[PDB]
């Protein structure tokens, strides 16, 4: 159980707010990795 | 609208939205979890 995704948008605060979210709006981001997991399952 | 707001001397910068969140009537101003302040209330009109 897991970052990144599209949280852009912070779904307007609609429920609290997530620790994702609190952590994006102080300098935190998380860079998506380069291959996806659809390409980690072609590889394997 | 980004706005630099001064709510009653508390200051920032930010989107004010209409909150789903209901105040207790004691209270004056929220908080999130990492203890930044996630919602207001208008000292004008009593909105959150
Ligand atoms: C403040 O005054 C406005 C009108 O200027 C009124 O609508 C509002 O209810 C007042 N707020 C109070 C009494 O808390």
């Given at each position: 159980?897991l970052?990144?995704?599209?949280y852009?948008?912070?779904?307007?605060?609609?429920?609290a707010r997530?620790?994702?979210?609190?952590?994006?709006?102080?300098?935190?981001?998380?860079?998506?990795?380069?291959?996806?997991?659809?390409?980690?399952?072609?590889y394997? | 609208k980004?706005?630099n707001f001064?709510?009653?001397?508390?200051?920032?910068?930010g989107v004010?939205?209409?909150?789903?969140?209901?105040?207790?009537?004691?209270?004056?101003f929220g908080?999130?979890?990492?203890?930044?302040?996630?919602?207001?209330?208008?000292?004008?009109?009593?909105?959150?």
């Open positions: 159980t970052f990144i995704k599209q852009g948008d912070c779904l307007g605060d609609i429920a997530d620790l994702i979210c609190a952590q994006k709006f102080n300098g935190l981001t998380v860079l998506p990795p380069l291959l996806t997991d659809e390409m980690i399952a072609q394997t | 980004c706005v001064n709510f009653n001397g508390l200051t920032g910068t004010l939205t209409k909150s789903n969140k209901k105040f207790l009537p004691f209270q004056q908080r999130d979890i990492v203890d930044t302040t996630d919602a207001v209330r208008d000292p004008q009109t009593l909105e959150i």
